[PDB]
Enzyme design. Structure first.
Site, short mmCIF file in Angstrom:
data_model
loop_
_atom_site.label_atom_id
_atom_site.label_comp_id
_atom_site.label_asym_id
_atom_site.label_seq_id
_atom_site.Cartn_x
_atom_site.Cartn_y
_atom_site.Cartn_z
N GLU A 13 96.91 -23.74 -31.18
CA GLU A 13 96.82 -23.36 -29.71
C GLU A 13 96.27 -21.71 -29.82
OE1 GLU A 13 96.30 -25.36 -26.39
OE2 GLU A 13 97.25 -25.99 -28.16
N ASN A 44 107.60 -0.35 -37.52
CA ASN A 44 109.28 -0.34 -37.56
C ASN A 44 109.63 0.74 -36.39
OD1 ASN A 44 110.51 -2.44 -39.01
ND2 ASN A 44 109.18 -1.94 -40.58
#
Lengths: 426, 201, 428, 22, 428
Positions: free
Chosen positions: E245, E197
């Site tokens: 992927e 954060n």
């Protein structure tokens, strides 16, 4: 047929070579876009001496524009007749050889030769068999005197049976730019006498004398002086492109001129050179052309030839001359100026007829003289070199790029030997 | 929007010109709002200027002459000092040729009619009457004021009375003559005038 | 492609270069916004569509000179990252700008130098402006220039130094500030051009004929030298030079790179029409000793190297006419061992004029940067200001208390002793 | 409590919006 | 078609979910009502009269956030029981959200997930947003992974965890909940992207230059990140990269799936317009050490693998040219045994900017998700925090009283140590 490969080196070279292709394109009549207009078969029956067909009918010059500073030939591209030159023929640089002969040759140059030798041989090998080379440069500068001299050395060892001849300017006596003149000149000469066939010397203040005393022009720029040099370059190689009575080749004037392999440095003349005012007095004919051949103020280099004796000389007449009054007066100037020539050669002075006069005039003649008057001029550079070598002035820029203390002493001794060989022959 | 944005001449200029711009744009590729370059204005109206013979001349009479406004007060000592030298400069500079060279407009920071006429009796160049609104509009345009009386919009005083401003066709300040400025060439700054390149086109 | 990265360090550097940038904006027709309605490559990048951001960094340890630019009329012109302000001022110490506070700015500044140099290869050089007698002008200048020499090897470094006056000083710590800068300037820079202040006062007194100009008029004339210096890169000319050739033009030994300046014509717009400026007359005013921008008497000086960059419509041969007569004159004494001593380059485009400036529109101009042995006066005078003030350790505790080692002032002087002797050794 | 101060810096005075070269 | 399911658990889960479901609505041009006036299939369903409903579930045990979303602006978009709310919060206790109060609403969560996955074929994968430091974000998240791995064993699971920062943490109970959740997401979570954060606080303070941001200022940046990862599924591009992927290209080992994040450019209104965003430049700005979104200096790590997601007017040669410079750059170290570890995923669509937000319209952007061995330090911090607290059994009795034995604290200790050792031995 026969090919002449053009290579322009240095800042001086690209600027001169720009106006040389001005006059050559004008001799044959190629429009600057590349198309042909001039509707004459004898103009461009020999066109392949300088140019190449491109299946659009356009002719691109066989010129390789060559430097290390990307701005000076960027200038040539944007200029008039710049769109002739092939974009692939440009070999840019980035750093720029900042007037240091050392970095032109050994250090900085060596990574760009991989490109310029590639482009020169691709154009060389394309034809049947090559005839000669042209190198336009300065022997005072950095990128022309040093990095151009590398290109002199490499192509010689690759084509030893071919010829090449250069037009190089030297330090001037009073005015002198580029405070490292004699370092750049002397290092270039001892490579030039070893790997070059023929050199035409130009002096800057000799050109300035011309535009004052003869041309009656107060304030023109480099444009006018390059025009005079461009005419001289066109005059020497006229006979390859056009027929005539007494023909000429670069190699045939090579065998005719130099007696010994070491000395091949030539003076330049041109006529007519009268002003606009004086044009109507003169009625141009063979004897007054020859009289302003042997005018010292008309000499392209300001080494006064009256002090020395002419060893040999050539005169490529151009136009429709009657050959008896050509050669008889040609002998007459040898008898008239008895002391001006050397004794141990009968028939010191030579001739040719190049059947096409340049447009805008009717009779022209270009002088190429192997004189001994260059005794004093190389002695000038010899003393100038010794002045800044006694305790190593400006030496650190060269020395830092892989130079030796020994190789400077060789250049002095080698170039001093050239002085000695001229003085011996009197 | 030269030399300032917030001037009455420029607000009138902007209003008129883009009124015209929108009208012809709708009637027809034309850039709205119009560039200050593309705008056209009439600087001095029909009955503004009046000369030495008390005759009104049109604006087209000022073509071909370096024109300069002169903000003057009758009772200000600096103006009383500057007046003779400006008059002498007008004299010599315009006499010395077979062509009119410069012209002066008089703009009055004066108090009242009597004093204005008394001061205007001394001047051989053009003037704008004091009751004419164009005087106050020109004052706010070129930011000349003797005292912070009329609000200025984050600007300052460009100068004080007296002042000479070489002007252009469109209210452009061509050059400022440093009489009482950052330079203080009192009575001498008049030689800085480049009359050749500032002609009222 | 090819360009030069400019650095401004210290207040003198900022406001001289703030004049230098506003001259360049109008040279290429760049608005203060940064738009234009192959000229501008060597001082500007192009951003997105139609923009031109400069190749510069502002550094100062005080906000007060640099933030005032941030709110000026050149708001959008500079990218807001290379304008750098510290917290507290350097306050006329070499030591403080070098040891304590100067360290925490070089760590961010060198990064932006890297960020500006890593785009295109073939950097021409580094044009760093600074004062010498100043605090941040020397200390921050040294630390930045020392780090640059190691990090970037072989590229040139131009340094315009606002040198302390022979007469005025406007600070007492000037001899302590000047001497210590030199010991850390010799082995870093490549071309250090020496500029004075009361010379330009004396110039503006005589030639400009304006009674009371200020630092804002000092800077115009300074800006006009720089423009004419780098005129060759920006514009084509009949005979051009480079910034990487100057060091091969001017310095005979690596430790001798302290050159003067000169400029002509320098004429009021009012007195301009009493001189049609010919090439015969402007060159002689270039060599006239009351026109150089350094204030040292050259009559006791043997010239060594000279580099003239002509500007505007000048043909090559009246240059050659002028230089012929110049060499034969015996008032301009050249040294024996250097018989050739001129470089003269030429550019086409005549010098611009700033609107509301003090320069009349001229058609031709000459700018001179010359190596002479008169600088032996500039240094032997300076050494006298040192040892007399270092006679009884005046102001020492300021430098000692800030971080410097007492006794480092000794080998700084012994360094300057060697620079004193070699000039005297050369001139004989 | 002040009526407004109207002297101006030399920098603000003279480095102004010049008409541009093209 | 190609659908993914986004699961939001906990406070941070819901509040991040608000930002992403605002951006996806705007990008596909669907209204707060839910109708537009087939690229949107990846995030939205189809229902009768042109309404597209989101494929998301909201889980929070505490009503005060989920309830207040239902009442807010986005009323009609979300299905009413796709938002699930409990009775009382987990209240920063891992034992509570996993044993006592978690179990009640897990079955209700699976039932909605079952009915949303079985709507069509070709379910691509699951995304999950949660707070590790929180109660239900750790508690309910661990149950929900355990009961999703058993059922949908096949599908991929991408986690976006709000990891506690090294300095600032918002809890003393956070070292316990961090190390107790790591034993959960080692063997259930496929690929975890590590968010911090106060890293985003630092990003939004020097790049975008907000001095006083908030939670709705960070969450937009997260929304733009998630939109860049899933830009490939939604829109046509030069090189498409799915969610399957990612697993095969970032993680070489089963246990090693902890990776950083980076976005470029995080640029403001004024900055953006004044600057060339070169394809070279955005990539260089992405690899900058501080510009990572984790507060984890990568200089003391080795990059194992790296994926770059381009978004905008991006040409493939500039991508190939820029990445070759990155490999030959000496600064960033790549592991010897992995010579190839770059991805080029280029998309056409420019990033869709919410105006009146904080970012500007930019032509092109890059978003980087890199697997590096710098994760050693971020576990070493939490490990040493856990050792000090557990040394004398602080805050243990709260966990023991709710059903969790003492000994899961013991075993999770070496589990983190087993993870710590593996990252050490892989860096050889």
């Amino acid at each position: 047929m026969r090919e002449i490969v053009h290579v322009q080196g240095g800042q001086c070279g690209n600027q001169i070579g720009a106006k040389f292709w001005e006059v050559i394109s004008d001799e044959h009549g190629i429009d600057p876009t590349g198309t042909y207009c001039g509707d004459s078969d004898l103009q461009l029956e020999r066109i392949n001496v300088f140019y190449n067909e491109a299946t659009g009918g356009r002719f691109v010059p066989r010129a390789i524009l060559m430097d290390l500073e990307p701005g000076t030939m960027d200038s040539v591209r944007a200029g008039p007749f710049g769109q002739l030159f092939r974009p692939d023929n440009f070999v840019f640089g980035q750093t720029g050889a900042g007037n240091n002969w050392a970095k032109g040759h050994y250090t900085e140059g060596a990574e760009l030769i991989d490109s310029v030798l590639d482009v020169v041989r691709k154009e060389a090998e394309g034809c049947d068999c090559l005839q000669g080379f042209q190198i336009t440069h300065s022997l005072g500068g950095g990128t022309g005197s040093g990095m151009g001299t590398l290109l002199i050395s490499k192509v010689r060892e690759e084509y030893p049976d071919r010829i090449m001849e250069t037009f190089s300017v030297f330090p001037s006596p009073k005015v002198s730019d580029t405070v490292v003149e004699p370092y750049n000149a002397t290092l270039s000469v001892h490579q030039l006498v070893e790997n070059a066939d023929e050199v035409q010397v130009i002096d800057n203040e000799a050109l300035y004398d011309i535009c004052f005393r003869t041309l009656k022009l107060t304030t023109p720029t480099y444009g006018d002086l390059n025009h005079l040099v461009s005419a001289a370059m066109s005059g020497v190689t006229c006979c390859l492109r056009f027929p005539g009575q007494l023909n000429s080749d670069l190699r045939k004037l090579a065998v005719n001129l130099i007696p010994f392999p070491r000395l091949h440095f030539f003076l330049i003349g041109f006529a007519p050179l009268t002003s606009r005012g004086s044009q109507q007095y003169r009625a141009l004919s063979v004897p007054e052309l020859t009289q302003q051949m042997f005018d010292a103020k008309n000499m392209m280099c300001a080494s006064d030839p009256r002090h020395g004796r002419y060893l040999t000389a050539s005169a490529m007449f151009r136009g429709r001359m009657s050959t008896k009054e050509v050669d008889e007066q040609m002998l007459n100037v040898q008898n008239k100026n008895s002391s001006y020539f050397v004794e141990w050669i009968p028939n010191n002075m030579k001739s040719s007829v190049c059947d096409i006069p340049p447009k805008g005039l009717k009779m022209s003649v270009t002088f190429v003289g192997n004189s001994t008057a260059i005794q004093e001029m190389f002695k000038r550079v010899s003393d100038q070199f010794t002045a800044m070598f006694r305790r190593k002035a400006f030496l650190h820029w060269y020395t830092g790029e892989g130079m030796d203390e020994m190789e400077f002493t060789e250049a002095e001794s080698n170039m001093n030997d050239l002085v000695s060989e001229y003085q011996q022959y009197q | 929007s030269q030399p300032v944005f917030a001037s009455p001449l420029n607000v009138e200029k902007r209003r008129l010109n883009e009124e015209r711009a929108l009208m012809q744009a709708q009637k027809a590729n034309i850039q709205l709002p119009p560039n200050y370059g593309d705008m056209d204005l009439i600087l001095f109206p029909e009955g503004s200027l009046k000369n030495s013979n008390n005759t009104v001349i049109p604006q087209s009479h000022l073509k071909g002459k370096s024109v300069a406004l002169y903000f003057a007060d009758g009772a200000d000592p600096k103006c009383a000092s500057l007046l003779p030298f400006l008059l002498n400069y007008y004299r010599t500079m315009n006499e010395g040729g077979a062509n009119q060279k410069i012209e002066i407009i008089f703009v009055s920071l004066d108090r009242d009619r009597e004093a204005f006429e008394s001061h205007r009796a001394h001047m051989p160049w053009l003037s704008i009457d004091l009751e004419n609104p164009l005087t106050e509009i020109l004052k706010r345009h070129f930011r000349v004021m003797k005292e912070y009386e009329v609000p200025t919009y984050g600007y300052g005083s460009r100068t004080g009375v007296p002042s000479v401003i070489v002007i252009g066709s469109d209210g452009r300040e061509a050059q400022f003559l440093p009489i009482c400025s950052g330079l203080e060439e009192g009575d001498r700054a008049l030689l800085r005038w480049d009359w050749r390149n500032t002609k009222f086109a | 492609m090819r360009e030069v990265i400019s650095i401004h360090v210290g207040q003198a550097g900022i406001q001289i270069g703030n004049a230098c940038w506003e001259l360049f904006c109008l040279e290429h027709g760049i608005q203060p916004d940064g738009q234009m309605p192959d000229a501008f490559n060597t001082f500007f990048s192009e951003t997105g569509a139609g923009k031109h951001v400069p190749r510069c960094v502002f550094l100062d340890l005080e906000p007060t000179v640099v933030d005032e630019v941030r709110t000026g009329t050149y708001r959008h012109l500079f990218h807001p990252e290379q304008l750098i302000s510290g917290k507290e001022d350097a306050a006329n110490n070499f030591a403080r700008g070098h040891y304590t506070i100067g360290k925490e700015i070089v760590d961010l500044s060198l990064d932006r130098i890297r960020k500006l140099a890593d785009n295109c290869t073939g950097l021409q050089g580094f044009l760093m402006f600074n004062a010498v007698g100043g605090g941040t002008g020397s200390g921050l200048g040294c630390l930045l220039l020392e780090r640059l020499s190691v990090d970037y090897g072989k590229k040139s470094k131009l340094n315009f130094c606002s040198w302390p006056s022979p007469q005025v000083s406007t600070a007492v710590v000037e001899p302590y500030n000047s001497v210590l800068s030199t010991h850390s300037l010799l082995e870093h820079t490549d071309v250090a051009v020496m500029l004075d202040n009361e010379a330009i006062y004396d110039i503006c007194r005589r030639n400009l004929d304006i009674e009371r100009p200020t630092y804002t008029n000092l800077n115009r004339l300074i800006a006009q030298v720089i423009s004419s210096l780098t005129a060759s890169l920006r514009f084509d000319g009949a005979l051009n030079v480079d910034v990487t050739e100057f060091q091969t033009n001017l310095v005979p030994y690596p430790r001798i790179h302290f050159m003067l300046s000169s400029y002509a014509p320098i004429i009021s717009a009012e007195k301009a029409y009493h001189e049609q400026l010919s090439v015969a007359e402007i060159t002689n005013s270039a060599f006239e000793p009351a026109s150089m921008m350094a204030k040292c008497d050259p009559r006791h000086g043997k010239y060594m190297a000279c580099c003239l960059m002509y500007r505007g419509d000048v043909v090559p041969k009246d240059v050659n006419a002028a230089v012929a007569t110049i060499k034969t004159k015996r008032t301009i004494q050249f040294v024996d061992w250097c018989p050739t001593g001129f470089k003269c380059g030429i550019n086409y485009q005549p010098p611009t004029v700033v609107p509301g400036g003090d320069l009349a529109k001229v058609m031709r101009a000459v700018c001179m940067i010359s190596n002479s042995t008169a600088i032996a006066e500039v240094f032997s005078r300076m050494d006298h200001k040192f040892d007399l003030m270092y006679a009884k350790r005046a102001f020492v505790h300021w430098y000692v208390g800030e971080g410097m080692e007492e006794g480092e002032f000794s080998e700084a002087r012994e360094d300057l002793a060697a620079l004193e002797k070699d000039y005297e050794e050369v001139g004989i | 409590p002040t009526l407004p101060f109207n002297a101006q810096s030399c920098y603000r005075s003279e480095y102004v919006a010049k008409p541009l070269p093209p």
